[PDB]
């Protein structure tokens, strides 16, 4: 299982894009990817990047039955926090199914930590669905807190539509 | 009642860290603010910022006890959705106590909506405690949605001691 995790590149969006459609369609829920690899481009190389992404890529023996060399990826920016200063978030990750079990994930764990450490993060914020009992158990593992449990935190989004009503109301 | 809702500057970050205090004194669950003016300044008016604050104003004739015209303040900052891309992420909003009930809110909720389509953000993102039944309601007389009943999501958070093993190991 030879595999390595880096930085993403710009190079390396078509790859990303194309594993969030994997993840898309992984995934319960049934949203579609609305982002383009252009949006990719612009929101995370070009001026401020508004999203990090690290990357599992393997070399050419192990490569995809579509000649991929990118086989997992984890999306992540910072975030704030008026107690405690600036936190590290992870969005997502995921690793295709014919590579799971080699280390991947975890390896890609502990490069966000690494990116913590460095930026100097206080904590890593990040969702788990409540009905994921396998991956919640994983991360208490590690000694994650639930704060929704312990807090009673609840997200809320305000949807484009209404923002608008209000922009003008 | 007059005010003005305006872009925070450096000028204004004692007043952030004062009114972050203050909404400290105010919220249930008892954690010490252990950021500094500095972090506000270093983190908010360096080279990145990492959060971004709309400030209440108001004339020297309504100036605080101990003469503010800083009376609220909203944190915010930008996040990233791999379905939809970019969006804006409300952190916390307060207004100090004899400035309640004048519209400082709604016109900091007003400015808040500009900014999401200044930037072309597809939703805002926020959290609510659970037990606050006037705040929720209040949110979905305004067309929002809760997240974590809808589909499951819970807060997570592994602290500084995890990630510090996990990037070392
Ligand atoms: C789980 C994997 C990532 C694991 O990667 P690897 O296989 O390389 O792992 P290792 O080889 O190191 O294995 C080590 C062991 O520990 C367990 N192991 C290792 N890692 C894990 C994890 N992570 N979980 C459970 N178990 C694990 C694992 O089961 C092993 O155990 P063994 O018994 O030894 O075999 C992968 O299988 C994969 O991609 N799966 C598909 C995705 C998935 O199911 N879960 C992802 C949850 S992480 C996600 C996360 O943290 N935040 C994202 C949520 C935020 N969303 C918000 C939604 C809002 C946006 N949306 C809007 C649009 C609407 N639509
Ligand atoms: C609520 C106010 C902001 C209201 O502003 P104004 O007074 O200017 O309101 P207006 O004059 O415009 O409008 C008046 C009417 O609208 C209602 N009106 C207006 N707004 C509201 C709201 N919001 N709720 C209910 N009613 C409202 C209000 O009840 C009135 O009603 P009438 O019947 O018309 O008279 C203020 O009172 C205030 O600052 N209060 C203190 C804070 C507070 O209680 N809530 C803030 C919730 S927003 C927070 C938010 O979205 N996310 C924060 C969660 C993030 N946490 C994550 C944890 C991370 C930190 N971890 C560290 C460890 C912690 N230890």
């Known amino acids: 299982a030879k595999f390595v995790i ?3 590149t710009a190079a390396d969006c078509s790859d990303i894009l194309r594993l969030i459609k994997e993840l898309a369609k992984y995934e319960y829920m049934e949203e579609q990817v609305i982002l383009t690899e252009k949006d990719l481009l612009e929101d995370g190389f070009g001026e401020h990047p508004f999203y990090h992404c690290l ?3 393997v070399p050419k023996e192990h490569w995809t039955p579509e000649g991929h060399s990118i086989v997992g990826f984890a999306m992540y920016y910072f975030t704030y926090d008026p107690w405690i200063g600036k936190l590290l978030y992870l ?7 014919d590579y799971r079990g080699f280390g991947i994930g975890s390896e890609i ?3 966000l930590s690494q990116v913590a450490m460095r ?3 206080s904590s890593m914020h990040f969702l788990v669905a409540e009905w994921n009992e396998p991956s919640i158990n994983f991360y208490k593992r590690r000694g994650a807190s639930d704060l929704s449990s312990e807090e009673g935190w609840r997200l809320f989004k305000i949807d ?10």
């Open 119 to 121: 930026c100097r993060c």
């Open 109 to 111: 764990l502990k490069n």
């Open 160 to 169: 484009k539509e209404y923002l608008l009503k209000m922009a003008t109301e």
């Open 6 to 8: 880096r930085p993403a």
């Open 55 to 57: 990357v599992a890529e």
């Open 91 to 97: 969005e997502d990750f995921f690793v295709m199914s």
